[PDB]
Amino acid sequence: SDTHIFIIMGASGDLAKKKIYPTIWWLFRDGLLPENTFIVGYARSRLTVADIRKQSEPFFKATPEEKLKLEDFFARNSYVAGQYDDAASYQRLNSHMNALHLGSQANRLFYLALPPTVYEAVTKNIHESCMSQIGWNRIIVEKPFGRDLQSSDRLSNHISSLFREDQIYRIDHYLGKEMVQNLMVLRFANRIFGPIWNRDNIACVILTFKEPFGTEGRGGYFDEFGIIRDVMQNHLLQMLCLVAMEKPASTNSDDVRDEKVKVLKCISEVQANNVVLGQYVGNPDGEGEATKGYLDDPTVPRGSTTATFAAVVLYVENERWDGVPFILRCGKALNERKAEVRLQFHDVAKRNELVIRVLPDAYERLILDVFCGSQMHFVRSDELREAWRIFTPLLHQIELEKPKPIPYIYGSRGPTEADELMKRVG
Amino acid sequence: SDTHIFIIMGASGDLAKKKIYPTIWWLFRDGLLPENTFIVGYARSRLTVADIRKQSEPFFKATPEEKLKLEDFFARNSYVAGQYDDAASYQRLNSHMNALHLGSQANRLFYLALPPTVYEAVTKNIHESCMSQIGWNRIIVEKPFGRDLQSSDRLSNHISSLFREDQIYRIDHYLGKEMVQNLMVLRFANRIFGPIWNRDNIACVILTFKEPFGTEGRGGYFDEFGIIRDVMQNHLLQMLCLVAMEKPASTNSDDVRDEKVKVLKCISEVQANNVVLGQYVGNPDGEGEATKGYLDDPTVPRGSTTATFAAVVLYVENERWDGVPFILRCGKALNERKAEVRLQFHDVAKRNELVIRVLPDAYERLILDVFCGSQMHFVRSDELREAWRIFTPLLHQIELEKPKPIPYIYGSRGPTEADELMKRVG
Ligand SMILES: NC(=O)c1ccc[n+]([C@@H]2O[C@H](COP(=O)([O-])OP(=O)(O)OC[C@H]3O[C@@H](n4cnc5c(N)ncnc54)[C@H](OP(=O)(O)O)[C@@H]3O)[C@@H](O)[C@H]2O)c1
Ligand SMILES: NC(=O)c1ccc[n+]([C@@H]2O[C@H](COP(=O)([O-])OP(=O)(O)OC[C@H]3O[C@@H](n4cnc5c(N)ncnc54)[C@H](OP(=O)(O)O)[C@@H]3O)[C@@H](O)[C@H]2O)c1
């Protein structure tokens, strides 16, 4: 119908005040939100709507002549306080949601702005207390999708037990404002160059995510995570799919995501001698955050073997590709800020290659994609499992054998051995 | 065999001293010339080899430690003096060429560094006096290939009467050091994207030759010629062919040139309402040659209606293309120095487009291409005729009706109406 509730589970939190409260303001402010939308915060910390505004409006960029819309926005806002495993609380939520205008019939969008240590609990209660009887129910689950296959599996199974895959919006939104455009053009590209993109013409596909800036004083988070999990397993691996996938049956969210998965099921398990891990050390003869290395960051615990740059060769194995090496190369603290897919062709009779680089605005597009109900740019349960199947074995070997990453100087291309790997293949 | 003669017909001239004498030095100097090569100058002006050196070595970039090769080069040089229609002179040439070591058997390369007002004469004499009996004979003919169809036809017929098309090397070499690379990648590109490049995917191909610099004090030459003849009829029209051509039967000089011609025969005659001619006026608020316009050049005769920039729509008409408008856009004194072919695609469910931009070194590659005997990057008699057939009617209408070109400010993109034309089509 025409009435929507946006439940921000964990409204006290950072993602809460710093991204979603604002990002929703910017969709209200420019009337992209369904007209009869309400916002309900739900955490333990006993606070008022006014209280949220005071710490959050800073990040809004409220200009003294839009402040009559804004007043109307906080009029739509409420907050109920309660535990995440206390049916009495989820009760005091669900019954307050019925109070709101047409709440009975209303659509329900649940944003789990909560560390997934509490997902099993929150999901179970939302199921049996809070789900709309008439309205659709959609849960936005946040990274990490677990750390290995075993863990992502155990959790993903808990959620796909309570919720249909068409209610599970897994949101990755951390690699910057253009992050969805990346995925669009690489699909618009599979369409065009489909008949060309074969082992026949192509020798070596390379997908590249460079960032120039460091970990910047938050290395301590990046640490318990690492560059393979932060960029490759999720994003790079996804666009690799968009390149190698077949003609989707249609343009349906599920027909494409099907095709992506089909690619993934035909990649076997990345092995160590196809991988060059690299950690950044600070710059002698530079200035800014570039004098500081990874280990100079005081939130990184002493002597971290954590990869801050990786180069990895995957083979898709079927008729269409095969021998064809996909190279995923990505790093924090490098030379440029580049996101590009290069396809090198067999220069039969200087090698020849094709390159692909990069008003609603990535995160914003994802909040609307979920309200609309297109699951396109979100990862599917089965897509994720396959993704983990691949990297887990390597990842497990690294946690265990704790191999020292190849030092590389801040603002470098990466380690030298990374390029020597690209060549040892094609 | 292993013995070659390079006859520079018109050795006194500019192209003589400023380009070919040097360019051959640079192929001798880096031993790319067949080992037993001789150089013979032939003009009227009674001068010595020494005499050539004095005015020409300046342009050589002779470095005081390669000057033992160089001595050996001028040892290979000679010069015989004679008229261009005096069988007694062509006699004193041909008999002096027999004198040279193995001249009897020798291969003969004739460079017509002569204004084509004398081509009919020189060609006829060379035929009946000078052609090697054993060795191959190749004539390098220089621009202009005439000015209209009637004229290019009358001359081209005179030459294709004395010489097999596999002896007629028509050399265009004036649009800069990378000019052959342009044509290479656009063919390497027809190969790759062949199956894609259809009316199905593509809406609007645009081929673009911008130069930032003026006519620079030599407008007076450009004038009796004009931007359609200087850049479009010849170069742009050629790469249009390389884009739209079919799979050549093989990679033979003649199989490809065949395919190019096939494209051209399927373009009908450019008409005036598909054309935006533009002349540059100098820059008020700039400096250098940019204060000066076209007409401020003192070699341009007062009130010239001469096009210094053109935008033209051609339609290739067959199954493969059709409706598909090729737009050729080119200008002297513009914003950048760009040579690029853009292919815009039908963005089914911001318009999407493919772009193509840009040790032996263009002119150098052409001198060797002719010694080797690959006629690839040279225009064919029949290719040229078709080229002229197209532009002549328009061109004739402009000489006759003398239409004032749209003024455009130096360092501009071109005239505004040029873009309004691109849109009135696609
Ligand atoms: N790239 C990334 O991986 C990335 C970036 C940012 C965040 N995230 C994800 O975003 C989600 C939200 O994190 P956040 O940054 O907003 O901050 P957070 O402070 O970790 O979580 C926000 C709220 O969660 C509650 N909370 C925190 N720790 C808890 C615990 N151990 N037990 C129970 N409740 C707890 C608190 O609510 P109350 O005190 O009010 O009850 C807190 O204000 C997480 O899933 C996180 O993994 C992902
Ligand atoms: N983009 C272009 O269109 C371009 C650029 C440069 C030149 N070209 C072409 O290059 C060729 C050579 O021209 P150039 O620049 O070297 O200079 P040029 O001086 O016009 O010709 C060189 C020599 O030709 C002879 N000559 C000149 N005018 C003559 C006439 N009316 N009758 C008889 N002989 C004559 C003279 O030789 P002697 O006094 O020693 O007998 C002169 O030294 C021409 O075909 C020209 O069209 C093309």
Residue numbers in the entry:
A (entry chain A), B (entry chain A): 29 to 377, 386 to 394, 433 to 500
Show sentences the authors wrote.
pmcGlucose-6-phosphate dehydrogenase (G6PD) is a housekeeping enzyme that generates NADPH. G6PD exists as a monomer, homodimer, and homotetramer, with each monomer having three binding sites: one for catalytic glucose-6-phosphate (G6P), one for an NADP+ cofactor, and an allosteric NADP+-binding site. The latter allosteric NADP+-binding site, also known as the structural NADP+-binding site, is important for maintaining long-term protein stability and for promoting oligomer assembly. Oligomerization is central to G6PD function as it controls the activity of G6PD; the monomer is inactive with both the dimer and tetramer being the active forms.
